[PDB]
């Protein structure tokens, strides 16, 4: 399946209360696959991650971080 659909499937398997915490851990982990990422780019990655629960139709639909 396509990546976004796999993402929403993995996220859906996480408990609602754990989805925002888990997305924060994903942003951290994604940085390891890149190395030197500036603070502006890090903030953007959290912004993108923040949108994923709505895209997925998953509560809660936004993560403050």
């Amino acid at each position: 399946p396509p990546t976004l659909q796999r993402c929403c499937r993995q996220l859906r398997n996480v408990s609602p209360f754990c989805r925002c915490p888990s997305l924060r851990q994903a942003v951290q982990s994604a940085q390891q696959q890149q190395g030197q990422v500036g603070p502006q780019q890090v903030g953007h990655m959290y912004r993108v991650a923040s949108r994923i629960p709505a895209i997925c139709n998953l509560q809660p639909m936004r993560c403050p971080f």
């Binding site: 990546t3 976004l4 993402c7 996480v14 408990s15 915490p21 993108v48 991650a49």
Partner: peptide, 25 residues
């Protein structure tokens, strides 16, 4: 702790990591 365990168990949200990288180029 519950959330960490669920993250690890769901493949460390590896596809979401891919999403987040895709829109962060």
């Amino acid at each position: 702790q519950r959330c960490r365990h669920q993250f690890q168990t769901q493949q460390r949200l590896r596809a979401c990591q891919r999403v987040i990288q895709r829109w962060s180029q």
